[PDB]
Structures are given as C-alpha cells and as structure tokens.
Amino acid sequence: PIAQIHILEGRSDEQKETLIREVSEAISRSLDAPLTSVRVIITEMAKGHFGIGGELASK
Amino acid sequence: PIAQIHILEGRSDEQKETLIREVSEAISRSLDAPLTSVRVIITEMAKGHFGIGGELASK
Amino acid sequence: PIAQIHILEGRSDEQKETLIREVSEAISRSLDAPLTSVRVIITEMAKGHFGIGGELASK
Amino acid sequence: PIAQIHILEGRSDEQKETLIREVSEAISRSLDAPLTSVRVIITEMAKGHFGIGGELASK
Amino acid sequence: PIAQIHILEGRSDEQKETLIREVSEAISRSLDAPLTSVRVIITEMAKGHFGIGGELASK
Amino acid sequence: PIAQIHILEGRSDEQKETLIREVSEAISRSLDAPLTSVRVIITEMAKGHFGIGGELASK
C-alpha cells in the first residue's frame, strides 16, 4: 500500500514523524497487510497553494 | 488534510470502509486536525498495473 | 500545466467534456499559458472509495 | 471535487491566487457542485524537475 | 523511488508489463538505486478523461 | 504519457536530468509513443517526509 498525504505547511518534525507512524499502522491493520510493505509520503502545501471553495487556505 | 491511498484490487467493501475510517482517525489525531476536514481517496490498482523491482505485482 | 481532478462517479460524458474545457481555459487565462500546453486528467472515484471526515461519500 | 495542478515555478502570489479562484469556479459550474466543496492544490515544479519529450523544461 | 505513469487505455498486458520493466530499470540505473526498491503504478485514462489544450484525447 | 516520479532529496542536477531522459525514452519505446508526447515530473521528498514500514526514510 502506498499513501500520499497532503498537509499544510507548519507542523513540527515530531508531529509528522507521528503522522507517518500512525497512518502506517492504520493501513496495516485495516488491510491486514505487513507493515513493512507500507509506504507513506507527506507532501506539504504552502498556505497559498491550497484552495477551499475558491478561497486560499491562508485567508 | 487529503490522503490518497493506492491499494491492489481484491479487498471487500467492508475492508475498504474500515481502511477509510482508521486512516482518517490516525491523520486527525496525529495532526490534531478536525476529523471533518479529512478527505480520503482510495485508488485500486489491477495486479498487472503495479510493479515492484521491475516484476508485476501479480507474479 | 497539468491538472488532475478527482470527481465522484456519476456525471455524463457531456458534463465531463465541459469540465475539461472549462478548467482548461481557466488555467490558460489565469497563468497566461498557451491553451495547447494544458493537460487535464479526470479520475473518477467510486462513491465507496471517497471518505469525508471518516464517513463514506456514499452515506 | 479535488484538483491538483502542477505548474512550473515562477508565478507571483496574485497569479496563483487567481488561478485557484478561476479553476475553482470552472469546476463548480461545470459540475454544478457547490463551490464550498471544491479543493485545489497547486504544486510547483522546479524548471529542472519537469521533462518534455526527454528534455528539461528549463532548456 | 515511486513512479506513477498515466497512460490512455488501449495497450495490451504485454505492452504494460514491458513498460513497467523498462521504466523500472531506467529509474534504477539513472539513480543508482536498487531495482528491488523501485515501485511503479500504471493508471489508465479513458480516452474521454484526458484533455489536451481543452479538447478530449479521443477527438 | 505522463510520469510522476517520487524520489528522496539528495541527487545532483545531472543525475536528475539523466533520470528524466532515461525514463522518458523507456516510456517512449515501451509504448511506441512519440517521445515529444512524454511528460515527466520529479517530486523530491525530504528524508523526513517518507515512511517505509512506519519508520522514517532518514532512520
């Protein structure tokens, strides 16, 4: 399984390290797949690179 | 947050519904973000559309 | 520019042909880029492959 | 609907803010979906991270 | 390394198996990375799900 | 054809220029598609943005 998570810039390294571990276990147990096969990719978005309803994430 | 998970075809609806819930909570609690903002997308791959080390996932 | 839009299954061919044209012009004029360089990709999601807040798109 | 647009680095913030608004309305009206549900993500590519026909975007 | 290739529907299984092997070696040797670490994902697009310059891939 | 390759940060410009050329030819010849139609996108991941088996790529 391969997960790509898009998050807004601003979290700490520990926070993202945690996210990678948590999401990785959730996939593993949800699909009964070996954890070692799970691959996660975090992609940060600049507050000005994310639109919601037409408005920027930043405002 | 927006997560897109790529999984091989073959799981049941219940299994994928569980995956979407689990992964969704893991992201929420890991980033302290409201669950209602989390968006998950499952993309299934045909066993013959996934390569590992050059070999097909199917063989 | 290359845009990949994820939409829930259910629209008509005409609707998606329109989406591809509209979005393609919006990118072109917004970035002053030649329309001929714009590439759009539509990816449909099964109602049961899209989660929002942990719940399935379908329910 | 969720759109991810890949563009080469170099545009101004106003230009990208415009792109996000324009593309967001185009999707909304094309699919008759509520604007508030539209999510756009801009991903910039370094001129040396984009290949066209085998050649770099930069040259 | 993880590559996701978007191709129009229509190729044979042998053709796609070849694509996965070729592209997988090209990445391996280009980055001097172990072939066993390379992961490829093929995503087919319906001729009516791909726009070029605003026009559908099919026409 | 459109390929998006995710690689860990650290390679040189020449190395990535090579990757773009190699992968681009591999796709071209594998699918008998004109090279000029091939589009490659490299996306670098920070060592702390890639998880394998739950552990960070960096450790």
UniProtKB/Swiss-Prot annotation, chains A, B, C, D, E, F:
GO process terms (BP): toluene catabolic process; xylene catabolic process
The protein's name in its UniProt record: 2-hydroxymuconate tautomerase
Keywords linked to the UniProt accession: Aromatic hydrocarbons catabolism, Isomerase, Plasmid
Assembly and binders: Homohexamer.
Similarity field: Belongs to the 4-oxalocrotonate tautomerase family.
GTP-binding is among the record's keywords: no
EC primary class: isomerase
Record pathway: Xenobiotic degradation; toluene degradation; Xenobiotic degradation; xylene degradation
Cited Gene3D superfamilies: Macrophage Migration Inhibitory Factor
InterPro entries for the chain: 4-OT, 4-OT-like_dom, Tautomerase/MIF_sf
NCBIfam families assigned: PRK02220.1, taut
